[PDB]
Design a protein around this nucleic acid. Sequence first.
RNA 1: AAACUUUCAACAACGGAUCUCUUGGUUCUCGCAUCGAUGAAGAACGCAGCGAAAUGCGAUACGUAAUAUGAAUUGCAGAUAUUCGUGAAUCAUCGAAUCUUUGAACGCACAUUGCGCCCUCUGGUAUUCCGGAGGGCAUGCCUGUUUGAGCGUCGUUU
RNA 2: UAACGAGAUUCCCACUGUCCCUAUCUACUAUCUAGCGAAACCACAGCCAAGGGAACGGGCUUGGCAGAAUCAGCGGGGAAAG
RNA 3: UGCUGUAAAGCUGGGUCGAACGGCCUCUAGUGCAGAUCUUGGUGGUAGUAGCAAAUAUUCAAAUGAGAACUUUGAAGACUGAAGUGGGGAAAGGUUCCAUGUCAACAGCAGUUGGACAUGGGUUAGUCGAUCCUAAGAGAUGGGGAAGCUCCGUUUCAACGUGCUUGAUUUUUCAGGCCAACCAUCGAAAGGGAAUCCGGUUAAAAUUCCGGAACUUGGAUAUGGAUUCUUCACGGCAACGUAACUGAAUGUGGAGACGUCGGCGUGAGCCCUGGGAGGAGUUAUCUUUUCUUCUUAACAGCUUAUCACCCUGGAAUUGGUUUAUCCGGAGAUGGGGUCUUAUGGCUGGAAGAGCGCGGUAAUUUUGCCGCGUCCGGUGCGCUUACGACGGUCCUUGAAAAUCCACAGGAAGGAAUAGUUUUCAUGCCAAGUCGUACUCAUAACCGCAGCAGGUCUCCAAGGUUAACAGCCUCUAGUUGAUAGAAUAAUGUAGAUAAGGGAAGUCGGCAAAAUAGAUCCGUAACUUCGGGAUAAGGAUUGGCUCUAAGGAUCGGAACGAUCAACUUAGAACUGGUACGGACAAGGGGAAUCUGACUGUCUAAUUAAAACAUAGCAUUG
RNA 4: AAUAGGGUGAAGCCAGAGGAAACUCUGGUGGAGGCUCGUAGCGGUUCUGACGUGCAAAUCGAUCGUCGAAUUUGGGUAUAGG
RNA 5: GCGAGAGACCGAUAGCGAACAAGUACAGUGAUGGAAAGAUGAAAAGAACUUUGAAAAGAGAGUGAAAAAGUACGUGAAAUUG
Lengths: 50, 112, 86, 249
Amino acid sequence: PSQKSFRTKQKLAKAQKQNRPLPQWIRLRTDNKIRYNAKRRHWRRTKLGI
Amino acid sequence: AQRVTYRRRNPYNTRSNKIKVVKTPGGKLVAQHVKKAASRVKCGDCGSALAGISTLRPRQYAQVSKTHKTVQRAYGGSRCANCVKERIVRAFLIEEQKIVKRVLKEQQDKEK
Amino acid sequence: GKGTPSLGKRHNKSHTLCNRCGRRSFHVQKKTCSSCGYPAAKMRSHNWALKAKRRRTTGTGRMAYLKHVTRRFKNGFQTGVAKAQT
Amino acid sequence: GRVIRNQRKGAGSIFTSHTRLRKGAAKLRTLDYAERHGYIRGVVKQIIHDPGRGAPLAKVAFRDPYKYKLREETFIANEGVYTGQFIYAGKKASLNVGNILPLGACPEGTIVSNVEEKVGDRGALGRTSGNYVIIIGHNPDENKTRVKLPSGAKKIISSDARGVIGVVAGGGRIDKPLLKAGRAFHKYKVKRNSWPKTRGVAMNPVDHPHGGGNHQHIGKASTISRGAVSGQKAGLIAARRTGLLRGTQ
RNA sequence: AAACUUUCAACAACGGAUCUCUUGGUUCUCGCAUCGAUGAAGAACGCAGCGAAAUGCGAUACGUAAUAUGAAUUGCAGAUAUUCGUGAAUCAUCGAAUCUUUGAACGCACAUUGCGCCCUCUGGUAUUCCGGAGGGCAUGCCUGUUUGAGCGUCGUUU
RNA sequence: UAACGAGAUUCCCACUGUCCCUAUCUACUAUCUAGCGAAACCACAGCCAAGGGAACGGGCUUGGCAGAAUCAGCGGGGAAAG
RNA sequence: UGCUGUAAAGCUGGGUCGAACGGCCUCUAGUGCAGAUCUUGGUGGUAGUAGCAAAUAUUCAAAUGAGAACUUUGAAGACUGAAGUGGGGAAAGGUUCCAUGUCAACAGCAGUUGGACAUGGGUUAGUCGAUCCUAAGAGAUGGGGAAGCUCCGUUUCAACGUGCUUGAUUUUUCAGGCCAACCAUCGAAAGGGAAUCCGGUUAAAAUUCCGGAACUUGGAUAUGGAUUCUUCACGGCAACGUAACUGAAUGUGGAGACGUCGGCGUGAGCCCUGGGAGGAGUUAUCUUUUCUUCUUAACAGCUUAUCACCCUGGAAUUGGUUUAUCCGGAGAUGGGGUCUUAUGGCUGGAAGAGCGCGGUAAUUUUGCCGCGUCCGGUGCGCUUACGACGGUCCUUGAAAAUCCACAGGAAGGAAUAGUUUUCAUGCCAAGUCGUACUCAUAACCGCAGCAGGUCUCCAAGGUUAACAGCCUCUAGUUGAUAGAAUAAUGUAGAUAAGGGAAGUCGGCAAAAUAGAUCCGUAACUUCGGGAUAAGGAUUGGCUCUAAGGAUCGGAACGAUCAACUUAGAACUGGUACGGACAAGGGGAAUCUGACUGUCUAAUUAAAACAUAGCAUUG
RNA sequence: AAUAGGGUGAAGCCAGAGGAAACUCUGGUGGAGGCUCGUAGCGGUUCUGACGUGCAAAUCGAUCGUCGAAUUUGGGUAUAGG
RNA sequence: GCGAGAGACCGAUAGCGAACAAGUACAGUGAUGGAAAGAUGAAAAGAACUUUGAAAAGAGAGUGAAAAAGUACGUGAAAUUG
Ligand SMILES: CC[C@H]1CN2CCc3cc(OC)c(OC)cc3[C@@H]2C[C@@H]1C[C@H]1NCCc2cc(O)c(OC)cc21
Ligand SMILES: [Mg+2]
Ligand SMILES: [Mg+2]
Ligand SMILES: [Mg+2]
Ligand SMILES: [Mg+2]
Ligand SMILES: [Mg+2]
Ligand SMILES: [Mg+2]
Ligand SMILES: [Mg+2]
Ligand SMILES: [Mg+2]
Ligand SMILES: [Mg+2]
Ligand SMILES: [Mg+2]
Ligand SMILES: [Mg+2]
Ligand SMILES: [Mg+2]
Ligand SMILES: [Mg+2]
Ligand SMILES: [Mg+2]
Ligand SMILES: [Mg+2]
Ligand SMILES: [Mg+2]
Ligand SMILES: [Mg+2]
Ligand SMILES: [Mg+2]
Ligand SMILES: [Mg+2]
Ligand SMILES: [Mg+2]
Ligand SMILES: [Mg+2]
Ligand SMILES: [Mg+2]
Ligand SMILES: [Mg+2]
Ligand SMILES: [Mg+2]
Ligand SMILES: [Mg+2]
Ligand SMILES: [Mg+2]
Ligand SMILES: [Mg+2]
Ligand SMILES: [Mg+2]
Ligand SMILES: [Mg+2]
Ligand SMILES: [Mg+2]
Ligand SMILES: [Mg+2]
Ligand SMILES: [Mg+2]
Ligand SMILES: [Mg+2]
Ligand SMILES: [Mg+2]
Ligand SMILES: [Mg+2]
Ligand SMILES: [Mg+2]
Ligand SMILES: [Mg+2]
Ligand SMILES: [Mg+2]
Ligand SMILES: [Mg+2]
Ligand SMILES: [Mg+2]
Ligand SMILES: [Mg+2]
Ligand SMILES: [Mg+2]
Ligand SMILES: [Mg+2]
Ligand SMILES: [Mg+2]
Ligand SMILES: [Mg+2]
Ligand SMILES: [Mg+2]
Ligand SMILES: [Mg+2]
Ligand SMILES: [Mg+2]
Ligand SMILES: [Mg+2]
Ligand SMILES: [Mg+2]
Ligand SMILES: [Mg+2]
Ligand SMILES: [Mg+2]
Ligand SMILES: [Mg+2]
Ligand SMILES: [Mg+2]
Ligand SMILES: [Mg+2]
Ligand SMILES: [Mg+2]
Ligand SMILES: [Mg+2]
Ligand SMILES: [Mg+2]
Ligand SMILES: [Mg+2]
Ligand SMILES: [Mg+2]
Ligand SMILES: [Mg+2]
Ligand SMILES: [Mg+2]
Ligand SMILES: [Mg+2]
Ligand SMILES: [Mg+2]
Ligand SMILES: [Mg+2]
Ligand SMILES: [Mg+2]
Ligand SMILES: [Mg+2]
Ligand SMILES: [Mg+2]
Ligand SMILES: [Mg+2]
Ligand SMILES: [Mg+2]
Ligand SMILES: [Mg+2]
Ligand SMILES: [Mg+2]
Ligand SMILES: [Mg+2]
Ligand SMILES: [Mg+2]
Ligand SMILES: [Mg+2]
Ligand SMILES: [Mg+2]
Ligand SMILES: [Mg+2]
Ligand SMILES: [Mg+2]
Ligand SMILES: [Mg+2]
Ligand SMILES: [Mg+2]
Ligand SMILES: [Mg+2]
Ligand SMILES: [Mg+2]
Ligand SMILES: [Mg+2]
Ligand SMILES: [Mg+2]
Ligand SMILES: [Mg+2]
Ligand SMILES: [Zn+2]
């Protein structure tokens, strides 16, 4: 809701910042195995449980 | 006809969420939030509304001059005129009878 | 109406985030965590749940201080500073 | 079986009394020097309805003998007590309706209410509307008084115990039928959760000793021993007799 | 007779068996004894020139000091970076530090980034009000210090 | 036992496609096309009659027969599925 | 490709492939699969099959694009129809918001579009909330249990103040004076509660920003006024008035602070309507016409009221008086006043704003100029607020923080000067967290963009009893795979000659009745009912008639103004007329439960449960 | 916090008519009730309708019960597995 | 727990649940439950360039020992399929 606690809004800020694609220069590193960010989250699909 | 919305987050018709409908200089019909109606100061003896005393919500009495909150008489803003009159007459008559019962007791403490 | 219609009436959280373990097991009305037992002084743990001990024990976090006790012990719990060689 | 409704009441979860609207505990004054040796005078300020009570209560203002203060007491209103009446309490108080006197200071045949079982407990006997205690006699040598209680029992109380002269107001309430389930609903809505009552014979054997059967019937004697245990005491407990009361008792 | 159906082979699919590996696991043996109110284990939130995670760290934030070593780091970029040297990189080592909000968690409280009080300094015409910086105020128990209470009680004076 | 009843029952009036005894009409399907595209189920499979047989066969024995590939319906059988 | 062995199997030719592997003598075992409704993974037939059919509905053109049933714009046709498909919020979600780009996946067709994907941007508060209070309740302490995890208890068998208020002192020491019933703390974004409004502004924020105009609390503090030589003001018979106009400990009160229903009254907003000043539409004909703008916030001053109260006076020939019958020698009617300011009026705020027009500037950031923005009326109208009343209960309808007044009389006070921030004006400050968006036939929960579920505010015209149904205005949508046909069987809906329950377990389903006015209404009855019993008549349109009121004028009369109700008559028509919509079938009996009420969420709503009443027991 | 619009017409009150009295009759007014028709709401009777690999692990449609109180409902709070 | 050495052990459906950003993703109100997932090549040398196509891609070409190794990557069985 619009009326939210600070602790809630801080969890939602971290949840927004973790929901980004992989930076592409990381795939060029030697012995790199990560092809994409495997921990993506859509708002309608998986809920935060906060 | 224009329709209005609450201006605050409270969506319920509670005692503190009463609204009036007001037309603004912009030609608009908006909701104006109405404060709860003040109750009248009442007599401590009979409970009737005291004359000459402003009807305010309790915190508003702190911010108003003294002539609004009292009446120039004994027990002015606390008791009504008739209850003060009855207190005065009762006090006088009862103390008079106390003197009468004392002198009478001294009259029966010297003959019986 | 105990299935789909009744499942539509779920908007009142029984649990919120715990301050000790951050898990969303803090019962609001009981004021207790079903996971770590907060605000009790001790941590909630049972011998009938060994996997639960696995999930939250030493080594599952940072060990920001126990990391180095072995390395300080191996040097006899040194006091002072290293001396530069001539 | 299951824990029965008799036994669920002691835990007092949903069976506590609904006391939000109650106007205070009705008590006599604390027995003090003024009441023990002379009398103290108070004035009736209010006569009010106490939810859950058939008897009105009287709010009576007394002066504090030791500090500059007013003490408001909650008395059970005797019938005939009015607002502005002066109430006198003590050993030397006069025999007027509403006055609080020791039992020994009241002659035989005195009708008294809110009587103390023990000296200073502030009223135990005859507190409901229309009820009272009759003073039967005195035993000044042993300092004892014989009284008759609303149930018809004779009791021996200390003559120092206090009571209020008159009958408790609000009597005759039971004379009118309630006529409706809703009236009983509103009656117990401010008393406690004891209504409505399901008959135990209408339950299953888990729920009650009377439950079960291919007809509704108790099956065994509904007179239960006094020495029976919780979960068994459903019915007529320690009944000396049963059936329609015929003749005098 | 085509088509179609079925079988087989070749090639192509589908799928991921088989083979071969292996910084993992499992089990046995040997040696050692080291958490925390000097704030642990754990949690939350942050921190990189360009990073989401894992790993590391704490506003000194993928780290500061020190010792050792001795020319890198590297996906790209870049020195007010470096090379016969107080000198690149390095959880190599590690003895000095920093260590947010918390947590046994300690001023009170906590579904709140809620509310105090004390000391010093400082800004606002201020011992009192408002702001800021730093340092403090939990409980049980032990030893001691000081201040006390009780006709519990000793001595003395009317 | 007045009143009340989505309670059970009988009769009467009104009413009518409930019926005699069916017919016609509308929309949406079904149908055909483009696109999209599951599931139940599946020993192998799938024409009958008699026989014998675990005493009611798709298969066995003896007969009738028997000609590609199929579409819409259908509910006899698969002692159909769950 | 073959060979060997009865066999389990061994060997070999060719192809593929890329790093290890075998024979023999022995050792060892987690050592051989067709099944276990076996396990895990993978794959078929079914099968291009079932299906993608609720919520009225789409069409033409242009633009964009490789590509348009589905995107955008225009034109049209529709719907939701103010108890909305409109405009907001609470819970819940968490970036879904906005712009740009964009189509691999997802949007069960498509896709240039999207709540998808990518990159950025975005949430501004002293006044709105939280924060504080207490509610049901939760829960430390002192204690008491318990082996203990911990349990009880909430002031309890407690030596319970990190007390305050002053005169200070500058001696950074003090002197005291009062109190310590109760009082840890947590517990409401719907209860209680200090204070803000209007206009404008963004792609997306606004009671938060900009402009203007206020307000509260805390602090500081001077000037003016007020007051004092009768020290702590005057006036009024009084109700009481005022710019102010000492007041400690302690005490007493008030506000906070309170159900529900009924009619009445007043206001506000909305609805309706006349004139005038503008704009748009219709114009074959008619229409001085149809639609539309004409507005005024918080705040300040003056004024304004039912009720209540005061003074006068002394009442039966009882009077006053409400829609509702209550009041008066405990002082009515009459006459004169006082008060609360709820609510309205005037003025300031404020026309400078906003709105409506006309004339011009320009790639143009953005405008500039002129005119107008005025005066009324109406009501069983609707909604809502308030008021004075009345009814109701074996039901009487929170608490606390907080604020004020009063009682009391401590202390301190003037003359060459004294006091006070409850009068006016002036100075300073107001921290922290939330604030975007959705709130649902796609932003929540039901595995999902699910016909389910999920609390609440505002509410136009016509018809009507009606906030029902039906049509429409503002606003919003036009979303739900589509095209072509129109067999059977369906699903939803209609109609049917004559008969009229013969159907069937059973009138199941359907039909019939239905609004309003008038007439008429049985048994039985607990006298309340039954009852809309049963059973009849009428109803349109048009043209008239009559009745029913208000305010003024000194009158059984004139003047002016005004609402829709009721009744009667004539005429009229394919005898129609509650013309759609909306809308009881009825009666005679038996069984059973008295009634209203309640339960087997998801097969049983009943005669079961409850119930009032009655009785028994402790 | 929420609950259109009607019907019926309880006490109390006003007036008239009759009566010697004890008292009776009539017309208004008034607005009672776990009253009644009927929306919203709450419920869930029947079609034993649709659907029954559903829109849905209980829905959809018509029909129906009730609709001012033992009413409906949000939030807070309490009760926890013999 | 810390540090080591081993084995007639298992060899990615095995061995710990986890050889990998594994007690991870994800579910559940909650206590708890809890996966799947290793392998191009010696070296990215990860296919410049031309051409058809709106694009994805295709066809030539190019690198490589091999493209019968193209990240949908060693080998590449069977079911099933052209
Ligand atoms: C185009 C819309 C009509 C078309 N026509 C054609 C003629 C006809 C004749 C019928 O019988 C003569 C009939 O029987 C019913 C139905 C029809 C259909 C019904 C359909 C609407 C209807 N579709 C199904 C359900 C439904 C639900 C609603 O809420 C709703 O509101 C808009 C509407 C509906
Ligand atoms: Mg509030
Ligand atoms: Mg006054
Ligand atoms: Mg709960
Ligand atoms: Mg009973
Ligand atoms: Mg019972
Ligand atoms: Mg039963
Ligand atoms: Mg039993
Ligand atoms: Mg027994
Ligand atoms: Mg029995
Ligand atoms: Mg039974
Ligand atoms: Mg029985
Ligand atoms: Mg028997
Ligand atoms: Mg006898
Ligand atoms: Mg292998
Ligand atoms: Mg090993
Ligand atoms: Mg809170
Ligand atoms: Mg019923
Ligand atoms: Mg078979
Ligand atoms: Mg046969
Ligand atoms: Mg046979
Ligand atoms: Mg067979
Ligand atoms: Mg044959
Ligand atoms: Mg069929
Ligand atoms: Mg069949
Ligand atoms: Mg190799
Ligand atoms: Mg060998
Ligand atoms: Mg085996
Ligand atoms: Mg097998
Ligand atoms: Mg076998
Ligand atoms: Mg199987
Ligand atoms: Mg399987
Ligand atoms: Mg098909
Ligand atoms: Mg279908
Ligand atoms: Mg319409
Ligand atoms: Mg409507
Ligand atoms: Mg909304
Ligand atoms: Mg958008
Ligand atoms: Mg699609
Ligand atoms: Mg597509
Ligand atoms: Mg996105
Ligand atoms: Mg506020
Ligand atoms: Mg309490
Ligand atoms: Mg406790
Ligand atoms: Mg203790
Ligand atoms: Mg609080
Ligand atoms: Mg609040
Ligand atoms: Mg309240
Ligand atoms: Mg504004
Ligand atoms: Mg907005
Ligand atoms: Mg401003
Ligand atoms: Mg009213
Ligand atoms: Mg009006
Ligand atoms: Mg205001
Ligand atoms: Mg003005
Ligand atoms: Mg009342
Ligand atoms: Mg908003
Ligand atoms: Mg939904
Ligand atoms: Mg969801
Ligand atoms: Mg449709
Ligand atoms: Mg016929
Ligand atoms: Mg006919
Ligand atoms: Mg007939
Ligand atoms: Mg029949
Ligand atoms: Mg028949
Ligand atoms: Mg028959
Ligand atoms: Mg029959
Ligand atoms: Mg029927
Ligand atoms: Mg009739
Ligand atoms: Mg019944
Ligand atoms: Mg059921
Ligand atoms: Mg069941
Ligand atoms: Mg049922
Ligand atoms: Mg009713
Ligand atoms: Mg009804
Ligand atoms: Mg239904
Ligand atoms: Mg059915
Ligand atoms: Mg079907
Ligand atoms: Mg509730
Ligand atoms: Mg494994
Ligand atoms: Mg595994
Ligand atoms: Mg592989
Ligand atoms: Mg090769
Ligand atoms: Mg290869
Ligand atoms: Mg391969
Ligand atoms: Mg094959
Ligand atoms: Zn926890």
